[PDB]
Amino acid sequence: MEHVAFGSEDIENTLAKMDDGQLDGLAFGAIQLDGDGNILQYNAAEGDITGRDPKQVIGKNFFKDVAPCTDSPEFYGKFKEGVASGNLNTMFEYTFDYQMTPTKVKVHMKKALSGDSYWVFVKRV
Ligand SMILES: *C(=O)/C=C/c1ccc(O)cc1
Numbered sequence: 001m002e003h004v005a006f007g008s009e010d011i012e013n014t015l016a017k018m019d020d021g022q023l024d025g026l027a028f029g030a031i032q033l034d035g036d037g038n039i040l041q042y043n044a045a046e047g048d049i050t051g052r053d054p055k056q057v058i059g060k061n062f063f064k065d066v067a068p069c070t071d072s073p074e075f076y077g078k079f080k081e082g083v084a085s086g087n088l089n090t091m092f093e094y095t096f097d098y099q100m101t102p103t104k105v106k107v108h109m110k111k112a113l114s115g116d117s118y119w120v121f122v123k124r125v
Pocket residue numbers: 031046050052066067068069070095096097098
């Protein structure tokens with residue numbers, strides 16, 4: 001397991017250093033999106049929660065295709081606001097329920113160090 005806690009203050013720095021196998025070693029789900037919501041990275045822990053194949057969701061749109069329950073002011077709205085302001089860093093509870101059993105989670109969204117890149121981190125609650 002990679003030695004990284006969900007919600008860490010410097011999580012973006014740690015993950016900037018990681019390859020795919022490393023991201024798959026995290027204790028929590030990790031998705032990297034571009035500013036339009038297209039899926040750049042998706043780790044094994046996230047697929048364990050959602051039943052999505054991390055190898056195949058890459059390239060799809062998280063808000064339009066994969067996770068319509070997040071296409072809402074409460075999730076997508078916060079993403080959009082943080083992308084626009086340039087300082088995305090927000091945490092909230094949510095329920096994921098499209099093509100998976102309804103699952104309560106805690107979500108942390110945070111701007112990545114690489115350009116036009118934004119993390120969505122997920123753990124069960
Ligand atoms: C609601 O439709 C949420 C769906 C979902 C959330 C997170 C994922 O990684 C995959 C699907």
